[PDB]
Design a protein around this nucleic acid. Structure first.
Ligand SMILES: [Mg+2]
Ligand SMILES: [Mg+2]
Ligand SMILES: [Mg+2]
Ligand SMILES: [Mg+2]
Ligand SMILES: [Zn+2]
Lengths: 221, 129, 83, 220, 24, 71, 102, 135, 83
RNA sequence: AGGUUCGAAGACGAUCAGAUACCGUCGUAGUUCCGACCAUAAACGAUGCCGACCGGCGAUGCGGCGGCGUUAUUCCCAUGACCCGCCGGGCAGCUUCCGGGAAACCAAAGUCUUUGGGUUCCGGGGGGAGUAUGGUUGCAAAGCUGAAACUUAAAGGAAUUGACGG
């Protein structure tokens, strides 16, 4: 986005920094070298937030360029992002795939899981290598959420952010959903979105089984 | 050791073209290299190119337009005549519609069609199509 | 194609990769063609039309489709200059 | 009675796509053989090249299956080669015919020199490769015919090339590799870049994105 | 026969031939 | 690889005529020993006198008597 | 058919490597080719440490250890099951087998 | 031992649970009776095996989802999963610990010198990476 | 990447590259003014000296030849010359 | 010269149907050094040399250049041992639909019908045969150079499936 309306905001920067989203791994990919800002003395590569925002807007433009919202497929094989892709698909009309990705979904036209999308969106190239490889048989362009150490073999609009932190993954799936809805005619762009980023977050069953009972105790007393 | 600077330039350009690089740097520059690249430029197979001038043999950065298939060389600079130029054409060029054989004649470095037009033969340098 | 009488004797003209200027073959299923939806000046809303790029299979297999699409967006102004 | 399960098949069935070149332009894969006989009806000619009985050594001596190579194509610019191995010869023949129909490629035709009528030969010399077999197709002047071995000769005839010189190297007795190398050489005629194709390409809407509103209501 | 032992047997045969020629 | 210099023709020609002795057809046709050993002596046909009528066993997979004449 | 890229030995920038005698059959083996097994054995077995400690004069004796660097030819190594035949993919793993320490 | 079920009973159990989840319940005899009319099972000995696996699977379904699915179950999990949205976000911390280098990045982006950002002492030693090889 | 700007590389890559492998050869060495203590004379010394230089006025030596660069003795200041 | 160990030949004891062997006890030449020969090895990376280009990564050896910090001494710099990098020359490794190849595999065995950077050696179906003869070298053993008659429809390579394995 080259315009002033499509520019970074201080609250968005705060959300990014709170969830992380700018600390990558200790390894760097030569194709992500131009997204990396600088690696600290700790050895962690720090990404460029303006660049990752530009990539996010580019992916949002690619998504909103498709007429049928059901024709874009959002996937994630990792539980740190399964909830995010499910909420994203519910919000934007996409078709979700969470967890196991059966081989031949895009290639074998026999099994009931078979589908033909026009755009694939991937939480992690390393985790979702199989759907990325299958996209090469069916003329399927892909967007991925890449980290500093992830391959870019079959990726087009790789957002160079993070694929390790649950907070970061959920936050940026929320960012993509909000941006595609805002560029569509559903949000006014002035007031903040009513959907909370923590909704897209994934949490561990250890705390799924305790937070609600603690809160119920707080309510009863 | 390096004995054919033109051959090295042409192989470097061929490799960069096959890799899809937008630019490539030929380290040793020569007048024959400049003329060969000029005829390729005039036919449109490459874009602009730059001659970096150090006080040694200069360097060249050429911009590849992505429309080059092969730009090989004919290292033994054979004596070609107007009577046997067409056999070279058949042996080297992919088709009669396109492709060029570059040869140095006493009228300058040119392609085979221009050499035939001004009725002169020379020494074959290389080809590109 | 386009013999000397002027008619185009060719049943189709194949697409070319906007990144590396290669013919995209009919059986290049790895290759992609993608639209990017631009927005209007003030409100940043989708204005209907888009801008199209094509990437061939070899280019988008060696791993540089990201860089290619980013450069094309910079050239067309979708990605700002100060990127 | 053909009920497709493909967006492309649905568009072809509903006559949205008016020619096979529309699919070829966007490089969409053909996964239903009923797509192409819609376009090339009563014009696709079929030929069986060879029936080689491969067999796998087991406890029960040898388990013999049959591999059928089939060259299909209309004599106007579309050819395809399909190979299928099966327990039975007739099923192998049908499978090979379907596979050849799926792997139909368009053939680019040029002129040897001084373009006058319709193009007849290959636009430039091309080379196909499979195993150790290398097949080189060389443009030929009008009226020469197809000078080649019988196996690539009938394949080029079904492709629609009228005139062509050829040169083959390697173990051409391997009919499968010979036919596949010739098919690759035929296929890459469009992949080869020529100065007349230097014009900056213009992009039209993909069939899917053009008929999105049809696929949602029909291919639900 | 192992090639090395063929070599050895050939050496013996050559010695025998040389001795016969030397005798004559 | 092979030399390609503008004045290596002597070496190329000498190498060709030196390596041409390494295939059986050229050696057979240009050494003369095969022609000397040939009972016909380079002739297509030849006349002779039958000395004896003999039978020759065929090779192993077959089983027959081939009728030949010593000439 | 070359079985191993390293030919079964660690010899890259060397011309000749001095040999050693296998500790089971006295076969001359190149030192880089031999299987090395550095055993730190307890000088007293686990069924005897109790008796030795009970009969030890000192209040707390740390029983010594026997340190021996065995070398094996591959014949002896395979026969004694120090090394095993592995699949074509498994042969390319240089990671030693796990210690099974927990 | 030797009570492991077979594909023949498992496929049928999954299918009839998917088709007739509303009709069926978690009672063995009720399930073995509903199966008698929702499926033409030739054998009683296989019918009640199917019924037993059906009761097992439905007892599982009441607790948590399995590989066999139901559309109402998907909708129930969708309407139930969007819960425990905290009254305060997990990403609105009053202060944010930030590195000096990232602070330089922010001032490059022009969004530096924010009140919420608090710079931290950079780590010293560069003692990352693990020692190479065993030991 | 494909769009490396081979004509105008940035100073960090230029300095990182080898002397001969740069776009134009530039030596990594320099000449420096050196003031040895107890005198007024300023001597020009190569930064990669292979000899043992010294102020004519002051008997102490100024550089010890080492592997790469001249080894200025403790207490001697040096200044670059015109980059 | 010197000869401890080992150990061709050899003896003996075993083992075995036989056992001129594998196993054991001895044990000659040799194995060690000096001088003079010999010029051969699966002398292997079964892979010419010089040069150019064509991916990524983590290491390692040497040299050089930078940098937070820890350490060694002393009152401070250097200067050594670590830590993070960069450069160049190396021995290599992992990965890759660069590309190649019959494949195994190979960043060279790539840049090869889109065939030409320079140059050396060398193969032409399998045997006969590295034989015969001639020459030459050597004290010898042998080394180098090196056919033919005749014979044969295959011999081979890489992978696959099976069958079998003390
Ligand atoms: Mg050796
Ligand atoms: Mg002894
Ligand atoms: Mg050479
Ligand atoms: Mg031979
Ligand atoms: Zn042993």
């Amino acid at each position: 986005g080259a315009l002033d309306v499509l520019q970074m905001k201080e609250e968005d920067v705060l959300k990014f920094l709170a969830a992380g989203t700018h600390l990558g791994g200790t390894n760097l990919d030569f194709q992500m070298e131009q997204y990396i800002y600088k690696r600290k003395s700790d050895g962690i590569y720090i990404i460029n937030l303006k660049r990752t925002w530009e990539k996010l807007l580019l992916a949002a433009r690619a998504i909103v360029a498709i007429e049928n919202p059901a024709d874009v497929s959002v996937i994630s094989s990792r539980n740190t992002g399964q909830r995010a892709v499910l909420k994203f698909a519910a919000a934007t009309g996409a078709t979700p795939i969470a967890g196991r990705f059966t081989p031949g979904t895009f290639t074998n036209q026999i099994q009931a899981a078979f589908r033909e999308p026009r755009l694939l969106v991937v939480t992690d190239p390393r985790a979702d290598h199989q759907p990325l490889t299958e996209a090469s048989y069916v003329n399927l362009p892909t967007i991925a959420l890449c980290n500093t150490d992830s391959p870019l073999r079959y990726v087009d609009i790789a957002i160079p952010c993070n694929n390790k932190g649950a907070h970061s993954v959920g936050l940026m799936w929320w960012m993509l959903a909000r941006e595609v809805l805002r560029m569509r005619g559903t949000i006014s762009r002035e007031h903040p979105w009513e959907v909370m980023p923590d909704l897209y977050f994934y949490r561990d069953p250890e705390e799924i089984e305790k937070e609600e009972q603690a809160a119920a105790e707080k309510a009863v007393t | 050791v390096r004995m054919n600077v033109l051959a090295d330039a042409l192989k470097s350009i061929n490799n960069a073209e096959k890799r899809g690089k937008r630019q490539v740097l030929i380290r040793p520059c020569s007048k024959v290299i400049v003329r060969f690249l000029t005829v390729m430029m005039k036919h449109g197979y490459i874009g602009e190119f730059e001659i970096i001038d150090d006080h040694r043999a200069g360097k060249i950065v050429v911009n590849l337009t992505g429309r080059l298939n092969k730009c090989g060389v004919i290292s033994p600079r054979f004596d070609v005549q107007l009577k046997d130029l067409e056999k070279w054409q058949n042996n080297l060029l992919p088709s009669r519609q396109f492709g060029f054989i570059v040869l140095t004649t006493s009228a300058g470095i040119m392609d085979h069609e221009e050499a035939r037009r001004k009725h002169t033969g020379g020494k074959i340098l290389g080809f590109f199509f | 194609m386009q013999n000397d009488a002027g008619e185009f004797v060719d049943l189709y003209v194949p697409r070319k990769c906007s990144a590396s200027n290669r013919i995209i073959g009919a059986k290049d299923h790895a290759s992609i063609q993608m639209n990017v939806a631009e927005v209007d000046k003030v409100t940043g809303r989708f204005n209907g039309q888009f801008k199209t790029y094509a990437i061939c299979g070899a280019i988008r297999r060696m791993g540089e489709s990201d860089d290619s699409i980013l450069r094309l967006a910079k050239a067309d102004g979708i990605v700002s200059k100060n990127f | 009675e053909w009920m497709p399960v493909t967006k492309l098949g649905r568009l072809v069935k509903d006559m949205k796509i008016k020619s096979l070149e529309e699919i070829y332009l966007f490089s969409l894969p053909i996964k239903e053989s009923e797509i192409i006989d819609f376009f090339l009806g009563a014009s696709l000619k079929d030929e069986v090249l060879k029936i080689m009985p491969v067999q796998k050594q087991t406890r029960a001596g040898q388990r013999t299956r049959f591999k059928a190579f089939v060259a299909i194509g209309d004599y106007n610019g579309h050819v395809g080669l399909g190979v299928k191995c099966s327990k039975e010869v007739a099923t192998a023949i049908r499978g090979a015919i379907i596979l050849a129909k799926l792997s139909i490629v368009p053939v680019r035709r040029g002129y040897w020199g001084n373009k006058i009528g319709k193009p007849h030969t290959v636009p430039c010399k091309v080379t196909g490769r499979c195993g150790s077999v290398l097949v080189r197709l060389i443009p030929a002047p009008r009226g020469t015919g197809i000078v080649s071995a019988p196996v690539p000769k009938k394949l080029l005839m079904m492709a629609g090339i009228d005139d062509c010189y050829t040169s083959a190297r390697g173990c051409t007795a391997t009919l499968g590799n010979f036919a596949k190398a010739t098919f690759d050489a035929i296929s890459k005629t469009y992949s080869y870049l020529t100065p007349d194709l230097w014009k900056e390409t213009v992009f039209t809407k993909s069939p899917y994105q053009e008929f999105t509103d049809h696929l949602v209501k029909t291919h639900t | 026969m192992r090639a090395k032992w063929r070599k050895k047997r050939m050496r013996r045969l050559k010695r025998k031939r040389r001795k016969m020629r030397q005798r004559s | 690889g092979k030399c390609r210099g503008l004045r290596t023709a002597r070496k190329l020609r000498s190498h060709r005529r030196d390596q041409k002795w390494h295939d059986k057809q050229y050696k057979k046709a240009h050494l003369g020993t095969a022609l000397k050993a040939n009972p016909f002596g380079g002739a297509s046909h030849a006349k002779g006198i039958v000395l004896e009528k003999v039978g020759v066993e065929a090779k192993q997979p077959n089983s027959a008597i081939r009728k030949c004449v010593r000439v | 058919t070359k079985k191993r890229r390293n030919n079964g030995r660690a010899k890259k920038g060397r011309g000749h490597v001095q040999p050693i005698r296998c500790t089971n059959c006295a076969r001359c083996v190149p030192k880089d080719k031999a299987i090395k097994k550095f055993v730190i054995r307890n000088i007293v077995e686990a069924a005897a440490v109790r008796d030795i400690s009970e009969a030890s004069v000192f209040d707390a004796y740390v029983l010594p250890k026997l340190y021996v660097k065995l070398h094996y030819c591959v014949s002896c190594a395979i026969h004694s099951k120090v090394v095993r035949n592995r699949s074509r993919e498994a042969r390319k793993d240089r990671t030693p087998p796990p210690r099974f320490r927990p | 031992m030797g009570r492991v079920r077979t594909k023949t009973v498992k496929k049928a159990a999954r299918v009839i649970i998917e088709k007739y989840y509303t009709r069926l319940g978690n009672d063995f005899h009720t399930n073995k009776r509903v199966c008698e009319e929702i499926a033409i099972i030739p054998s009683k000995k296989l019918r009640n095996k199917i019924a037993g696996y059906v009761t097992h699977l439905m007892k599982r379904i009441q607790r948590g989802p399995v590989r066999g699915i139901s559309i109402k179950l998907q909708e129930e999990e969708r309407e139930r999963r969007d819960n425990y949205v905290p009254e305060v976000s997990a990403l609105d911390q009053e202060i944010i610990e930030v590195d000096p280098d990232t602070k330089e990045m922010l001032k490059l982006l022009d969004f530096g010198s924010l009140s919420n950002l608090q710079v931290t002492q950079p780590t010293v030693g560069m003692n990352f990476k693990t020692p190479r090889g065993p030991v | 990447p494909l769009a490396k700007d081979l004509l105008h590389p940035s100073p960090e890559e230029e300095k990182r590259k080898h002397k001969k492998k740069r776009l134009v050869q530039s030596p990594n060495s320099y000449f420096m003014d050196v003031k040895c203590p107890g005198c007024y004379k300023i001597t020009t010394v190569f930064s990669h000296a292979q000899t043992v230089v010294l102020c004519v006025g002051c008997s102490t030596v100024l550089c010890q030849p080492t592997g790469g660069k001249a080894r200025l003795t403790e207490g001697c200041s040096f200044r670059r010359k015109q980059h």
